[PDB]
Symmetry: C4
């Protein structure tokens, strides 16, 4: 029986460095055809990403994936808002933009009967990337949806996932995925693990999947179990070219819910798909990105990596108890 490792099981060994954190480059591929300026993708969750968060993150150089708990019309409207965003431009020099100068944005679809309806409307709204957003990417329905989307929109970037195995990554690449999203049961106490008994710890899932994907020059997006900026360094070091994060952005000003005051503390009142909640307020997307990017830069500094590609080439991990 194989042991599989999570981010918390490992540490990166410091290496010889000639580069300061401020001078490392953190630009990366989202898909084989889309570049983002920082390696951060926001989760297609109804507590995380609508237009306001998506634009706030594109402006910082990442990309938001608009969630699909919306009618196809309203999801398209959200994409449009991001697409139709001069000091405002000058002040955001890292902003991730398309070939026309508009902020990048993505949208999630599933594999249900409205899927093509949704795709069509998202495309016409100017969406840059479609994410086939499912917990079980290695499945007939996801493969066929991917092939249908690809047959109809050959030039449309498609992220497919989620998977956690080399075979799953290869199947999705062979079917036309422009990036593969990795993460099945990441997070020790998540629903999939507890309810289904299913998962692959995320360090191992990233390393084995990225090894297959590299053979095809397809980028891996590591989705899930990112709690700390140190997890991003680890995920990217393990072979991911970007990381999708949810819970971390759920506490920002721009996340969908309401900001409230409770007993001297600021919270972000959540409301998803129903379920309701309240997470600590963490500031703006900008603040959160700054800390995360700060930590990424410092990890890269420690490893002497000038670029994300170098980080992966220079990565030496050790397992800890």
């Amino acid at each position: 029986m194989k042991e599989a490792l999570t981010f918390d099981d490992v540490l990166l060994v410091p290496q010889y460095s000639e580069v300061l954190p401020k001078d490392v480059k953190i630009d990366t591929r989202l898909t084989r055809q889309i570049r983002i300026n920082i390696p951060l993708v926001s989760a297609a969750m109804d507590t995380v990403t609508e237009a306001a968060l998506a634009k706030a993150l594109a402006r910082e150089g990442g990309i938001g994936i608009i969630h699909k708990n919306l009618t196809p019309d309203e999801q398209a409207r959200q994409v449009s808002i991001v697409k139709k965003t001069i000091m405002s431009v000058i002040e955001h020099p890292n902003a991730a933009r398309d070939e026309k100068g508009r902020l990048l944005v993505g949208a999630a679809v599933g594999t249900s009967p409205e899927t093509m309806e949704r795709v069509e409307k998202l495309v016409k709204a100017g969406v840059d990337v479609i994410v086939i957003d499912t917990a079980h990417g290695h499945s007939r329905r996801v493969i066929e949806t991917l092939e249908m989307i690809k047959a109809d929109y050959p030039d449309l970037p498609v992220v497919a996932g989620n998977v956690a195995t080399p075979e799953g990554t290869e199947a999705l690449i062979k079917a036309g995925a422009d990036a593969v999203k990795v993460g099945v049961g990441p997070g020790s106490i998540c629903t999939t693990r507890v309810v289904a008994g299913v998962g692959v710890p995320q360090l191992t899932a990233v390393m084995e999947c990225s090894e297959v994907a590299r053979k095809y020059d397809v980028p891996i997006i590591a989705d899930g179990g990112i709690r700390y900026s140190g997890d991003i360094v680890k995920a990217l070091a393990a072979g991911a070219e970007s990381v999708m994060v949810g819970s971390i952005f759920a506490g920002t000003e721009e996340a969908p819910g309401e900001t409230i005051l409770y007993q001297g503390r600021k919270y972000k009142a959540y409301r998803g798909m129903g379920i309701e909640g309240m997470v600590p307020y963490k500031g703006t997307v900008k603040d959160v990105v700054h800390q995360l990017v700060g930590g990424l830069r410092s990890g890269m500094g420690y490893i002497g990596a000038r670029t994300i590609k170098e980080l992966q080439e220079k990565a030496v991990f050790v397992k800890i108890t």
Copy 2:
């Protein structure tokens, strides 16, 4: 020194799937001759199974084992109640029934002097299965009780246990067990482990025992340490064909105790063999089964398993830290 693994030590790796959770089949063998419609057996515990719970579970397609902390007369009466249960029929399409159309039910016996008295009365009450219910199945007294029951009632299905080792499973099969119940010291903080220093972590006990039993086409019932629906997938994936659960059913409406209100919360006031208590109220047997079966279906979905047999053939486990 062998390391032994519990359910919490492992996860199931997701596999290629063409089957939706709703379309997987969860029917299974209880014994070599009895089928149940879901893989759930309720514990022969005086806090878990009397007639009301046993009938509520048979109606959902599982089977209850009436506990033996009762006089042989009263235990027989409880079996009779279940046996003598039209919208009522229509509304429960998954109901586990005998060859005569009556809800299935089991009863526990021990190895003490009244054992045959009990057996006789349970049989005459129409019991479908006898469970030789002991913590130490691999023992002279359990083997002889089993042989005596089998000599007297050759056609009566007999579950014997509990065991945790291949040798124990083989001895009980050679003596006529129709199913072997596996679980000695499952649960990290259970009495047997703490008090006696004795146990085998349950994933390993299921895998080694089921390997022996498969040679004889005898079903393994995994008894103990099931906390979450994900544990059922793991137990069944490890070679069990059903799972016995106690603590999970202890909080239902139908479990023997009283439902009470304490400070705005519902509880199930327990009272066993004395000891007394209070567990959170979890709803009806139906509600609890639905969640458990939901989680089983989803795990099977993830693994692409259409049947329990396929789940065991497609099972790939990884060990986690």
Copy 3:
């Protein structure tokens, strides 16, 4: 680097059994020449063993070691009280007695200048066994003290310890130890480990030490880290012939301190070598022994061991996570 295991790292595998807990024999050697009727020795700690506890335990078939935080005169008086203890006799059939019919008792000495003074007075008080009671048995001073005691009192049973290594056990046996007490840094959060960085987890220390000692037919006493009756089964299964316990007896009526009532609960107000405290009241020595012996019997039952020697021959351990 060797991994070393503690009691909590392992479990005993259940084996074929033809013997009931009530029919196992739990009599054992304390030293090569002294038998006790249950395998329990009380700790030579000023919070655990004076005359009252020592006699209460000898009466149950174990032996108390009177602590040495006393003047040689007062320590001798305590031994005398135990030695000079008819329904009273009849009611305690398991009582551990010397060749003259008096309750057995031991006393601790160190290696400081009064040591021989103490020894002489303890011997004249009728002490059955001397324990050279130190945290570091594998040392010049303990070896020489042992040789001096042995040269002066060749017939006096001497326990020497503590050690945790084969070399330490062999050195103490070669110097005349009649039993070797094993336990350096047992207990995860104990003083020796934290303060000195020193210890050997106790399962491994018992197994390697007992392996050396067996070559010489010298009994190993496992001292420390016994929290539960299951630990006794494990210690004895690992090669110990008795177990020394402190904290467990610290809460009994007979332990030196005062019994007090605090907010509806009974406590045992401790007072040692100064330091002061309060542990939950656990009942009488008799009550505590009964539970411990109960658990030992059940573990032996599970393993099919009729005697302590058989328990060690039938012991199969597995390591758990």
Copy 4:
């Protein structure tokens, strides 16, 4: 993937001893040319070391490193205070002194533009040792700073660090380090690990680094993750010749902050580089040293080590779970 061990993962095995704790020698090298009388170096942290703490520790036989969150002038003044410190002399017989009879003291520098300014002023204030104090010692900037300091002040003892790898230790030795400070990400919950994903557990970092350094007779200072006196024994046993400690000295009378009373308890109100806090008051530097030195002596006693060199030669570790 290599597993790396922290202090908490291991224990020292007790060995044959002929030496009492009080008779072990704890004098050690700080650098290849500076001796201290106990193996304790205080952290160059603004919550730990200014003149008052530095002198209190030199008087006990250790050495303080004055922190660099000060202007070069004020940092020099702090060094001067320590340098310009008769019962006062008699009462401190273990005091660590230079060749002129003055208390030893160190000072931290970085690699920023004022570095040489700082060095010059510290040298003129009579500093005994310069510590190139950085989180990433294995870097161009630290190597060049070290070479510049060494070229300008060839006779000035220079500690360089921090590193956690053989290559880092060798690079710093080849560049003229007089001691190498080891510790990158030591402490399970420290900033470097969480924020950067970077670290090497400290037992392994000490053992591999000291192995390189020994080839050059350069002393390793183990910096970080010392919580208990048992950690010092472990660090020194693993190949370190001294240990740098911060948090432990942060609670002493002599540490920079204010002593306050809060609800019957004494605290040390901290104030660093801003951030503010409050740690439990632990007494004087003298009290804390006594306990630490007590624990070191006892560990050495247990291992039979007369000297720190013997401790390293006699060290047998075991890994625990």
